[PDB]
Each structure stands twice: as C-alpha cells, then as structure tokens.
Design a protein around this ligand. Structure first.
Ligand SMILES: CC(C)(COP(=O)(O)OP(=O)(O)OC[C@H]1O[C@@H](n2cnc3c(N)ncnc32)[C@H](O)[C@@H]1OP(=O)(O)O)[C@@H](O)C(=O)NCCC(=O)NCCSC(=O)[C@H](O)[C@@H](O)C(=O)O
Lengths: 306, 393
C-alpha cells in the first residue's frame, strides 16, 4: 500500500534532487539558494526546454528523461497551480521516490484526483502541496526553509505550517536540542503526507528521541494522530511528544489563509484537537513561544539530558 | 465568494436540478410582468440580499418583510416598488441595511416533506461524499447531536463517478418512496455532477423535498466554492457579490492578501498563515483582543507589508499593531526601513510592535528605534504579545 513509501520522507546525504519548474522565477531562486547551500540538485524539468542549461545544470523535457539521466531520487515542484497536479502525476508515473510540491493554490478537486492515483501505488511519496518541504539538517534540504537555523539533533518535527516550524526549530536549537528530521506537510486539505505518516518514521528512528507536532484548525488529522499515538506510543519505549495547535481564536466558517484551515459545519476547532492530543499523552504548549522549553522539560523528566 | 439566491438557483437549474420557477426583476414594472408570466396559483416575492432574516426585515421605505406571498400580480408590482432601490435591514445586517437592486418573483411551492442533502469532499476518505438526513429543514449539526443515527453517508470514487446504486440508496435513506425515490436519485446525480463541474467545496440542499403534487424539488440551497479554482471558474466568480463583505476584506483581496476581521483592537500580520493564526492566539493568551488575521504569505515582499499597513491604518477599531516577519535571506534592515517608510507615508497613529528574525536584526531594531515614530521591537513572540497588550488603554 501507499504507506510503504513513508520511508522516502527520510531524505539524507545521498538524495539527488530535480526541480520541476526549474527555469521559472521561484524554481530559479530556490535552486540558486540550494546550489549556494551545497544541495545535490542535479537538474530540472520545463516542458519544451529539454537540452537547455540552467544554473550550470541540465534541463529536461520530462521527469522520466531527467530521472534516467541523473539518477534523481527526489523532485521539488515550483509549477503554477493550473499545471501542478499534472506535474505531480508525472513524477508519480516516473516513480520518483519522493516528490515535494511547494505550489499554493492547486484546486482541491485536482488534489482529490492526485490522491486517487497516489493511494494506488507505492513507489512515490508526496509531501504537499502548499508546503515548505523537508530537511535532514546537515544532510539534505528540499524546499524553501532557511537551513542555517537548523542543527542536527534529537527532535522530529511535523507541521502544517512553515512559520511555526521555524519557531520550533529556533527554540529547540537555542536550548541545545536540535532536529533529526523536519517535515512540512503543508496547509492544504488534500495532500500526500499526514501526521501519522511522519509519526511512524519518528517512532522507529533511533535518532529521533522526541517529537513536536504542529497543527491548526481544519480536518481531523490531529485527532487521527492522537489515536495513532494511543495505540503505538503509550507503552514501553515511548517518546515524548509536544504540540501546538493554531487557531484558538479563529472564527467559524472562514479559511484562515491556508485552504485547509477552516472550522466547517462545527468541525475542525482547535480545542477538540488539543484535548484529543492531551488524552494521547501529548504535552500541548498553549503558547507558540514555548515549544522548545516544553520539550526540553519533557527530556529533563525522562533524564534524557547531559 | 457568495451568490444571491437567484444566482445559485439559476446555476442549479442550468445543470438540470429542479428548483422553483422564477424570474428576476430590477424594477417594479418588471416584477409585475414577471408575475404575470408565471401564471402560478401563488407567487412569492423575495428581496435579493445575502444576509439572513429577510422574512422579518424592514425596508427604509417603511415596508415590513422581505418575502411576500400573493396571488395577484398587481400586488407583486406594488410591493416591489417599495423594495427596489431601498435598503433592507435584518437581524443579520448592519442597522443601515443592504440596498436591494433585484427581487425574485417565483412560483410559491408547498413542501410536503423536507430532507437534508449535501455533497462535499471527505477529508478522511479522499473523495466526494453524499451526506443526507430524512430530518430536513434544521441545522444538520443539530441532527448530528440529537440523532446521529439519522445521518447517512455515501462515499463516491472520483474517477468512477456516482453510481445509480449509491443515488438510489441515499434517496431511500432520505425517506423518498416510489417514483419519488427515482426522482430524488436522479436529482442527487445531477447535484453530484454540478458539484464537480463548478469546483464547489460544498453543495448543500436544505430542504431537499417533495411538493404535494409529486415533484422532488431543491427548495433552497447554499453553494460554497473553492477559491483555488477561480482561474477556471471566471464566470461564476464574476457573479461574486462583494457589497456585504467588510470593506477592508474587499480591499485586501485586491492585493492577494488574506484578511479576516475579528472583534478586537490589536491588529496583527505575519508572513505565513500558521504563525498569522498563532499571533492572533498569543495576543489573546496574554490578555488582548486581536482585531484581525492577516497572512502575507510565505516569503518577504516589501510591497505586501506596505499594503498591510494601508489596510490597518484605515480601521478605526485598531489601537495597536503587532507585526511578525521572518526575513529569510532579505536583510532585516531593508525590511525595517520599509516599515518606517510605510508608517511615515501612511501616517501611523497607533503603537506598533515589531518582531523580526533573520539577518541584521540589531541594525533593524536600531532603525525602528531612531525613526521618531511610535514603534518598539520585540525579542520573541511572547514579548511581542505582552508589549502589544500593554500598549492599549
Ligand atoms: C512558485 C509558484 C508555484 C510558481 O510561481 P513562479 O515561479 O513565479 O512562476 P513562473 O511562471 O515564473 O514559473 C513556472 C514555471 O513552470 C513551468 N512549468 C509549467 N508546467 C510545467 C510542468 N508540468 N513541469 C515543469 N515545469 C512546468 C513554466 O513553463 C514556468 O517556467 P518558464 O517560465 O517557462 O521558464 C507559485 O504559483 C506559487 O505557488 N507560489 C507560492 C508558493 C508558496 O508560498 N507555497 C507555500 C510554501 S509553505 C509557506 O509559505 C508556509 O509554510 C506557510 O504556509 C506558513 O504556514 O507559514
């Protein structure tokens, strides 16, 4: 099943990346940043520009050709909303192991169709859309996050929001803890990776000693994660989990920036997510400013420091 | 976006959904002529505004009631004369009411039975779902509380499309019998295809019901749309009635900013939706009332910061502003100089608290402090919230 591809989330120092939308404005900017950073970006696609050169790297007409010629194992998508679902499907059909879709604004119906294909295969793992990407600090960064605030360490972070991840990352570097793997699953309602997908990886990763789960209003993914944690993180060798849930002050029936951030028909409020997570053993930080201190204290209680 | 009743009912009718016969009129004489064309036993005249409570509303002509029944077309013309061009006030409008430019003149239909039927994408099953209840005419959230056993669902595969077996099963669980069951199944099918065609996030029919004469009719409905599909729904989004939106929200939309007004006096904005929500929250946690949510989107665009100030300096409820910006690769001194520029040119009159993270923060904070403007810097989000709360009296 599609769950078999969860492992592809754990990018590392061998991950080779192609950029779909490579010659576009944001594809160019973030590829320029990635190359300055030392990332193993090896090429990119723009239909019709195969055989061109860009940032010293080859451009390809198709993901299939790019994959065959470069051995790429991941792709990152900076393709505009009308065509980005097609770009995701192209990567799935080319069996790229990990696809990271940055694009904001893909029609929800388009993503329901993409998910249909995604769920019926297991070669390709999709993160996104409307997400900032994934980083294994010091080994591989795919997406738009600032690498410098990260430090390789002990905390796995999964988040529906990049700005809140940056808070969590800064706070956990300041107190000396660091990050094992950070996954931004993005703000859209229909996407390729949920909290459980990441929790599975974190709970089985020896490098991950604690977890930060960052959520918000909308949907039921946080509640599903709570049930997963009751089943798989409630006995021996459990790991501390800290969470913050955005949207306590959100009014009902309004999309709070993110397409997926809406309290609809009385469902999706923050209070219910906080309570569900608390019942699964999660320490919910009421303030977004206290994620690092909250997880630090949980390490202290378990005698996990110095 | 929102559609007037006549707009959503025409959209449904154009796609094979059965709704009441009606015409739209923008003058009393046109309402008169429309009433005669219906040749109906009973006619309903309805003022077209988005806000609820039209039935108990009052026009500033003095006429009571935005919905009137009559058998006489001449009465339709007379009452329309005291609606069109006047403002209709209801419990859900400002006391000034809403200008009525159009009225619906429709055949009044009796409702023998009421049910609930909605179509949306199921966020747990990845695919459309039909949600229905034989308990129609009420808040579906109330049926789920009182009687969760009266809520029925059919999960649909987006590539297979709706199947007759699914439509018939839902029609039966909604309480339709005999030929009316077959009619309801057909209407469910047409509603499903409509839902996909228009990139709705939800098509909700309440009541979905029957007339004494033996017809299944969508008596009233609410359609919510996917804003992400506007680029392929130009004609529907051109119908968007913005006249009842908060003006600041309409202005923010012109510049691709997502503003949501709240009941408070500490405004804020952030370059990222999650932290934009959490900044509203942390203002509350520290004893304040956030005035708005405002997401600039990820990344740094000085022009969006400028437009954000232009929006907020216009709101008289705003007594303080909290800005949180992560500069990424952009030197924060450039951002800081942009902030002071905006606050000078737009004449900032309220205390501003700024939280910046990125490169060159020390210089940026010095720029803000030497500006001669009511601007203070914060060292983290909690400090920012406490400073913002403490700046209002
Ligand atoms: C960046 C894009 C996709 C494209 O804009 P541009 O690059 O300008 O767009 P172009 O137009 O300059 O460049 C697009 C290029 O693509 C090429 N092409 C088209 N089809 C394909 C195809 N099938 N395969 C490959 N390439 C193709 C096209 O020819 C062109 O190339 P060419 O011109 O022909 O050479 C934007 O649409 C967007 O989506 N922008 C917002 C991104 C965003 O913000 N995402 C959320 C991040 S997360 C976050 O913000 C926080 O987490 C937050 O949520 C929180 O909570 O804090």
């Amino acid at each position: 099943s599609y769950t078999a591809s969860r492992q592809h989330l754990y990018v590392d120092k061998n991950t080779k990346i192609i950029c779909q939308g490579f010659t576009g404005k944001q594809g160019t900017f973030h590829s320029q940043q990635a190359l300055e950073y030392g990332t193993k970006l090896v090429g990119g696609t723009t239909p019709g520009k195969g055989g061109q050169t860009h940032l010293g790297l080859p451009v390809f007409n198709t993901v299939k050709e790019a994959k065959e010629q470069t051995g790429a194992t991941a792709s990152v998508i900076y393709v505009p909303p009308p065509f980005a679902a097609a770009a995701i499907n192209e990567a799935i059909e080319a069996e790229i192991p990990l696809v990271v879709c940055i694009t904001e604004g893909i029609p929800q119906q388009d993503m329901v169709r993409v998910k249909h294909k995604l769920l019926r295969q297991e070669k390709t793992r999709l993160i996104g859309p409307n997400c900032p990407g994934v980083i294994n600090p010091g080994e591989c960064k795919i997406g738009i996050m600032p690498g410098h605030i990260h430090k390789k360490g002990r905390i796995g972070i999964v988040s529906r929001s990049g700005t809140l991840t940056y808070e969590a990352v800064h706070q956990t570097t300041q107190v000396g803890l660091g990050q094992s793997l950070c996954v931004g699953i993005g703000g859209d309602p229909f996407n390729g990776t949920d909290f459980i997908d990441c929790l599975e990886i974190f709970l089985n990763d020896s490098a991950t000693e604690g977890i930060i789960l960052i959520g918000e209003i909308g949907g039921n993914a946080e509640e599903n994660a709570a049930e997963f944690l009751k089943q798989h993180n409630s006995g021996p060798n459990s790991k501390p989990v800290v969470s913050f849930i955005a949207g306590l002050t959100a009014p009902p029936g309004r999309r709070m920036g993110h397409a997926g951030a809406i309290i609809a028909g009385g469902k999706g409020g923050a209070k219910e997510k906080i309570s569900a997570l608390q019942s699964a053993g999660v320490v919910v930080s009421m303030s977004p400013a206290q994620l690092g201190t909250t997880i630090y204290k949980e390490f202290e209680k378990r005698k996990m420091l110095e | 976006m929102n559609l007037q009743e006549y707009q959503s009912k025409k959209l449904m009718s154009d796609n094979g959904v059965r709704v009441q016969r009606f015409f739209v009129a923008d003058t009393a004489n046109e309402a008169l002529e429309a009433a005669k064309r219906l040749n109906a036993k009973e006619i309903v005249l309805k003022a077209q505004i988005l806000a609820g409570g039209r039935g108990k509303g009052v026009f500033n002509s003095g006429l009571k009631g935005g919905v009137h029944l009559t058998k006489d077309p001449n009465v339709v013309g007379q009452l329309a004369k005291q609606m069109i061009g006047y403002n209709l006030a209801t419990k859900q409008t400002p006391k000034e009411g809403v200008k009525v430019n159009k009225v619906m003149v429709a055949e009044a239909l009796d409702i023998s039975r009421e049910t609930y039927l909605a179509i949306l994408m199921d966020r747990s099953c990845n695919g459309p779902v039909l949600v229905g209840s034989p308990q129609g005419g009420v808040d579906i959230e109330e049926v789920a509380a009182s009687n969760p056993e009266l809520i029925f669902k059919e999960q649909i595969d987006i590539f297979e499309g709706i199947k007759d077996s699914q439509a018939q099963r839902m029609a039966e669980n909604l309480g339709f019998v005999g030929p009316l069951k077959s009619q309801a199944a057909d209407q469910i099918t047409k509603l499903y295809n409509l839902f996909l065609k228009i990139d709705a996030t939800q098509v909700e029919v309440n009541p979905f019901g029957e007339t004494p004469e033996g017809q299944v009719v969508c008596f009233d409905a609410k359609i919510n749309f996917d804003d992400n599909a506007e680029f392929r729904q130009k004609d529907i989004f051109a119908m968007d009635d913005k006249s009842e939106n908060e003006p600041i929200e309409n202005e923010a939309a012109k510049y691709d900013l997502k503003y949501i007004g709240l009941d408070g006096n500490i405004a804020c904005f952030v370059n990222g939706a999650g932290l934009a929500m959490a900044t509203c929250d942390i203002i509350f946690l520290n004893g304040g009332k956030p005035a708005n949510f405002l997401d600039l989107g990820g990344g740094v665009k000085e022009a969006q910061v400028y437009q954000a100030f232009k929006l907020l300096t216009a709101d008289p409820k705003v007594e303080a502003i909290l800005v949180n910006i992560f500069g990424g690769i952009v030197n924060c001194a450039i951002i800081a100089n942009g902030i002071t520029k905006a606050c000078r040119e737009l004449e900032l009159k309220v205390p501003l608290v700024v939280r910046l993270e990125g490169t060159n923060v020390q210089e940026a904070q010095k720029i803000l402090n030497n500006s001669g403007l009511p601007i203070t810097s914060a060292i983290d989000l909690e400090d920012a919230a406490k400073k913002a709360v403490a700046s209002v009296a």
